[PDB]
């Protein structure tokens, strides 16, 4: 439900206030049962996540255990690998920036705890190129850990071998995709591959590979070291566990709090963070999972709590759980319009739907903000939107269509008036 | 996306990794599996950018040589990513985040202030070559929606006057306290932490026999 206890908050060093470095980490006791866990077995680790029923902490939601289970199949003579994507291009995902800037070890032991679960030879962490600062913090942390012998061959005084590496991103949101990151590592252009060859079977350097949101890798060790069931209790049904929530825009105290999942949307701005700037009635709309997910208008805001099942009932996605809030002084139409501008400046262009479709919606959306376009065009953008939604090679085209669909779904009268406003002044 | 050879930006310019740089080069390679030096392109191309911001056609060709890859390969990587600059950026490259999260926090409000202070249009270098302003997209520090990235400095919660203090510090002197401004630090509920003030529970706590 809500009011996650500090005693249950995984990322204790959030907000810093501790030594993100190892000695702070030791007081955190992050490396407490690592040898034991690995000793227990890879099968024991996946039993822990299956019991946890953790969902993907990245924009896509899938059982974390089943995804890791897939490349637990016997090696075919190719080294298995771990890829941690610290890229978070999605607006409002400062969620991950926290775990690199702070509590970097949380992720380092997440990597080896996760590594033996998939039997990965090594893990590469792709941080956003922008986070040069963040990249500096982690390898200082990674360097500490090996010096200790926590990672490396015979890591944590155990038979198992692991090596952790950090890879420089280069300002691309699409590099965040499950497969495209792999291609970026491989050194080719960051263009996603098709799903038929699933990442596990075909991978980074053509070997089995798996990709996890940094939050997903980070919570593993604590979910196993601590009781996974313990975590499970926090979640709701399929939904489970605490996921960091970032609230940004039109709220009195924008902040990232790792409060519990399944939180009433009205409650998290009202109780933690900062109540919606201007009052809870000054809420034109809420973007729950970030730019990719459709915004939900106030009417439904207070009604649904934050969890992926509840949101999909609501037609929106928990995604990165980045809450972007809009007051009534905003231009709903120009707000979403810049997100389509966010996607035309960013989609790879590999696939026909997304390439022309996202540019086509950008042109129509800019006219919509001006009000130059006629009212009949508004549903035509509906139809352009679903052509892009099911036909794209990756999910970004999936993502571009949803905000457009949300604007037409709940704010169709406002766009018509902008239509009307321009027609009147001629 | 076409490199029309120009006396300044052309193959004529000689590029070569400093003895120190070449060292760095190798370090990167080994990170990748053997015989996969190809992957070194992005990281290496980045060090060519570290060497020189311009990174001219000559520099890319050099990268191809070092990693043994086909030049077109490197050319494709440089063009795809915004991080690499194929034109001479200014000494201080100021990038203002203007995605919706920041906009709603008047990120644009920052823009107008910076254009006037630099006294220049958005997208080009100052005559002084001192600063270069560009309207970049989300930088991943939405919590502090007002935000500008100055050569990694990554400042935040910036207000016209805040940027004012910052731009003056860059123009005279250096290292202008890069980071947030209001003192909200990184993602602190401004009013109060509201969480984690109970000190950490320490090691062993909660193990619950896993």
């Amino acid at each position: 439900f809500g009011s996650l206890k500090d005693e249950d908050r995984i990322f204790t060093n959030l907000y810093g206030r501790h030594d993100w470095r190892l000695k702070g980490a030791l007081r955190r006791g992050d490396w407490y049962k690592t040898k034991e866990i690995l000793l227990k077995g890879p099968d024991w680790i996946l039993g822990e996540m299956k019991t946890s029923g953790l969902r993907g902490r990245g924009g896509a939601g899938f059982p974390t255990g089943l995804k890791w289970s897939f490349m637990n199949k016997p090696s075919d003579g190719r080294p298995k690998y771990l890829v941690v994507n610290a890229d978070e291009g999605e607006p409002g995902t400062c969620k991950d920036r926290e775990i690199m800037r702070h509590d970097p070890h949380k992720l380092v032991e997440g990597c080896l705890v996760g590594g033996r679960a998939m039997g990965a030879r090594a893990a590469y962490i792709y941080i956003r190129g922008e986070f040069y600062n963040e990249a500096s913090n982690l390898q200082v942390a990674i360097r500490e850990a090996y010096e200790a012998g926590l990672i490396g061959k015979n890591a944590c005084g155990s038979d198992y071998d692991f090596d952790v590496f950090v890879v420089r991103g280069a300002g691309a949101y699409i590099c965040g995709e499950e497969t495209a990151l792999i291609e970026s590592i491989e050194g080719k252009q960051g263009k996603p591959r098709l799903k038929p060859p699933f990442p596990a079977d075909v991978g980074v350097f053509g070997c089995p590979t798996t990709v996890a949101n940094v939050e997903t890798v980070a919570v593993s060790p604590t979910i196993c070291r601590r009781g996974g069931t313990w975590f499970a209790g926090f979640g709701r049904e399929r939904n489970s566990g605490t996921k960091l929530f970032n609230i940004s825009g039109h709220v009195n105290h924008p902040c990232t709090v790792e409060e519990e999942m399944s939180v009433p949307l009205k409650e998290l701005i009202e109780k933690h963070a900062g109540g919606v700037t201007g009052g809870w009635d000054n809420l034109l709309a809420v973007i729950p999972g970030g730019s990719s997910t459709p915004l939900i208008p106030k009417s439904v805001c207070e009604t649904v709590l934050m969890d992926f099942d509840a949101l999909v009932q609501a037609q929106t996605g928990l995604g990165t759980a980045a809450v972007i809030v809009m007051d009534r002084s905003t231009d709903i139409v120009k707000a979403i319009a810049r997100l389509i501008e966010f996607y035309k400046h960013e989609s790879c262009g590999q696939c026909t739907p997304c390439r022309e479709g996202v540019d086509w919606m950008n042109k129509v959306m800019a006219r919509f903000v001006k009000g130059d376009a006629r009212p009949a065009e508004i549903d035509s953008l509906w139809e352009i939107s679903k052509q892009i939604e099911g036909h794209t090679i990756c999910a970004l085209g999936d993502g571009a269509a949803w905000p457009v669909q949300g604007l037409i779904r709940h704010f169709r009268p406002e766009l018509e008036d902008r239509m009307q406003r321009f027609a009147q002044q001629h | 996306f076409v490199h029309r050879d120009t006396p300044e930006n052309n193959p004529d310019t000689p590029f070569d990794f400093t003895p120190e740089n070449y060292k760095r080069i190798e370090a990167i390679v080994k990170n990748y599996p053997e015989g996969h030096q190809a992957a070194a392109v992005l990281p290496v191309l980045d060090l060519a950018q570290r060497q020189n911001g311009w990174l001219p056609i000559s520099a890319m060709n050099k990268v191809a040589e070092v990693l043994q890859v086909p030049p077109m390969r490197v050319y494709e990587v440089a063009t795809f990513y915004t991080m690499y600059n194929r034109k001479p950026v200014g000494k201080y490259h100021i990038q203002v985040c203007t995605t919706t999260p920041c906009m709603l926090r008047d990120s644009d409000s920052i823009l107008e202030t910076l254009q006037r202070k630099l006294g220049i249009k958005v997208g080009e270098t100052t005559p002084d070559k001192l600063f270069t302003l560009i309207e970049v997209e989300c930088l991943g520090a939405c919590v502090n929606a007002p935000m500008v990235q100055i050569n990694d400095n990554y400042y935040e919660d910036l207000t016209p006057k805040d940027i004012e203090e910052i731009i003056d510090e860059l123009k005279a002197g250096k290292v202008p306290k890069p980071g947030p401004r209001s003192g909200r630090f990184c993602c602190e509920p401004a009013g109060g932490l509201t969480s984690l003030t109970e000190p950490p529970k320490g090691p062993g706590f909660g193990v619950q026999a896993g």
Binding site: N133, G152, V166 | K23, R24, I28, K30, L47, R50
Partner: peptide
């Protein structure tokens, strides 16, 4: 921090990294 510090950390963690497989 400086432009070359991230890669120098890599320069340093080279030894830390054990050997890499070859195809």
């Amino acid at each position: 921090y400086n432009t070359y510090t991230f890669l120098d950390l890599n320069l340093d963690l080279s030894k830390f990294r054990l050997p890499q497989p070859s195809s």
